[PDB]
Design a protein around this ligand. Structure first.
Ligand code: CL
Ligand code: CL
Length: 162
């Protein structure tokens, strides 16, 4: 198991514009297009992302292309972030995947704010971090995905994904 598969499991694949758990316009593998309520605006962002007039629909390859960009962007974001980078460098390969997942989902900033859990992760207090991570809107809104992510940080294995 790796980051791509992991995220593919958490986000799914949709080739047609859809609304996310928050009600935001999305396409492919969790690619947020816009926070605006307008489908038009969404479609326009989509066309700009793909580089063609899509009319709200894309192919698998297109979706995968957005996905590769998005993962690349997430790692790079962590790496440039002053609060995140150290957390990331302190972790093993599996747990690094867990942190990338949260960032892909909630953005850097979002993640940069679990200040207390970050400290705990850096000190390698797994059980503690997992508890603290659970006290969050994140966990309350997407409890099943969140539990998968937290078990990965707790255990250091891919078990939640098997
Ligand atoms: Cl884009
Ligand atoms: Cl969920």
């Amino acid at each position: 198991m790796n980051i791509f598969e992991m995220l593919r499991i958490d986000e799914g694949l949709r080739l047609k514009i859809y609304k996310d758990t928050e009600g935001y316009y999305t396409i492919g593998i969790g690619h947020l297009l816009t926070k605006s309520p307008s489908l038009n605006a969404a479609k326009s962002e989509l066309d700009k992302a793909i580089g063609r007039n899509t009319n709200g629909v894309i192919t698998k390859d297109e979706a995968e292309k957005l996905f590769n960009q998005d993962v690349d962007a997430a790692v790079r974001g962590i790496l440039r972030n002053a609060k995140l980078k150290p957390v990331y460098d302190s972790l093993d390969a599996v747990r690094r995947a867990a942190l990338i997942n949260m960032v892909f989902q909630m953005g850097e900033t979002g993640v940069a704010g679990f200040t207390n859990s970050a400290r705990m992760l850096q000190q390698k207090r797994w059980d503690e971090a997992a508890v603290n991570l659970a006290k969050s809107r994140w966990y309350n809104q997407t409890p099943n995905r969140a539990k998968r992510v937290i078990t990965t940080f707790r255990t250091g294995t891919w078990d939640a994904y098997k």
